[PDB]
Amino acid sequence: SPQLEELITKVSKAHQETFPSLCQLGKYTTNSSADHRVQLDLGLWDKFSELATKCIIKIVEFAKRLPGFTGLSIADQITLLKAACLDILMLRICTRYTPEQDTMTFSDGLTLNRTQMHNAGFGPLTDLVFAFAGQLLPLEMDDTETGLLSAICLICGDRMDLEEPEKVDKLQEPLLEALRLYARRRRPSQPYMFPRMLMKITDLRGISTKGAERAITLKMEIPGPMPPLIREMLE
Ligand SMILES: CCCCCCCCCCCCO[C@H]1O[C@H](CO)[C@@H](O[C@H]2O[C@H](CO)[C@@H](O)[C@H](O)[C@H]2O)[C@H](O)[C@H]1O
Ligand SMILES: CC1(C)CCC(C)(C)c2cc(/C(=N/O)c3ccc4cc(C(=O)O)ccc4c3)ccc21
Numbered sequence: 001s002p003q004l005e006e007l008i009t010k011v012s013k014a015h016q017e018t019f020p021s022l023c024q025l026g027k028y029t030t031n032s033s034a035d036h037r038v039q040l041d042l043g044l045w046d047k048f049s050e051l052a053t054k055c056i057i058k059i060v061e062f063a064k065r066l067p068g069f070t071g072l073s074i075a076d077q078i079t080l081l082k083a084a085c086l087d088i089l090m091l092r093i094c095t096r097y098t099p100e101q102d103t104m105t106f107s108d109g110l111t112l113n114r115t116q117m118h119n120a121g122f123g124p125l126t127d128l129v130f131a132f133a134g135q136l137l138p139l140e141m142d143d144t145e146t147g148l149l150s151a152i153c154l155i156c157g158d159r160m161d162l163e164e165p166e167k168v169d170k171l172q173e174p175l176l177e178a179l180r181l182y183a184r185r186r187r188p189s190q191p192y193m194f195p196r197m198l199m200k201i202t203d204l205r206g207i208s209t210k211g212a213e214r215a216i217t218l219k220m221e222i223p224g225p226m227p228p229l230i231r232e233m234l235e
Helices: 002-016 042-064 074-094 114-139 143-154 165-186 193-218 228-234
Strands: 103-105 111-113
Touching: 002 143, 002 165, 042 074, 042 114, 042 143, 042 228, 074 114, 074 143, 074 165, 074 193, 074 228, 103 114, 111 114, 114 193, 143 165, 143 193, 165 193, 193 228
Parallel strands: none
Antiparallel strands: 103 111
C-alpha cells in the first residue's frame, strides 16, 4: 500500500514529463492541404514523421522510468518497446483529440485537422483512428490513468521472443493493481471504468496492426526510406 502509492506517482510523473497535456501546449496550425484529402502531402509527412521519431524517443524515456523495466534484459526491453510503441503512439495522439475542432495536437503544439491527419500519412486509417479517439472521450481518463495504461500496454509477457516472460508478467502485476486502485478511488460511482480501460488495450492492438499495414503502403508513396527509429518500431 505505501509502495503501490509510490508506483502510481512514479508512473504518472514519468508520463507527464514525457508527454505534455493538451491543456499545457500552445497550439498552432498549418494551411497545408487543409480542405481536401490527397494521397500524401509530403511537407506534412516530413513534419509528422519527425514528430513520430521524437515521441518514440519519449516513449523509450518513459519506459526506462517504469519501476523494474531496466532490470529486464536489454533484449527484452527492446522487444517490449518494438511490440508496444505504435500502440502507445496511438493512445498518445488520441488523448490529444479536440472534438469541437476535429483536431489532434502534437507535442510541439502542431494542431492538424482530420483531413491534414489523413494527408500526413494516416490515409485510409484516418477515420478509424478518429473513431477510437472519440470512444476514448467518455472514459474521461486523466494523465495518471493514461500513464498507467501505457505502462500496462508495454510491460506484457505475451510478446513473442521474450527471454523472461515470467519476469515481465511480475512487473505488470503492480501496474494493474495500481490502475484499478487509482481509478476506483477517483470515481467510485463508475466501477466499470477499470475494465473499460483494459479493453482499450485490445482496441489499440487492432489499430496498431492496421497502422503497421498502412506503413507498408505509405512506403510506396514517400520519396525515401522512413526514419530509422520508425523502421525499428515496424520490425
Ligand atoms: C520502438 C522502436 C525503438 C526500439 C528501441 C530503440 C530506441 C532507443 C532510443 C535511445 C535514444 C538515445 O538516447 C540518447 O539520444 C537521444 C537523441 O539524441 C537523446 O534524447 C534527448 O533529446 C531528445 C530531443 O532530441 C529529447 O526528446 C529527449 O528527452 C532527450 O533525452 C538522449 O537523451 C540520449 O540518451
Ligand atoms: C509507422 C508510421 C510512420 C506510418 C503509419 C502511420 C501513419 C499509421 C503512423 C502513425 C504514427 C502515429 N500514430 O498515432 C503517431 C505519430 C506521431 C505522434 C506524435 C505525438 C506527439 O508529438 O506527441 C504523439 C503521438 C503520435 C502518434 C506513427 C507512425 C506511423
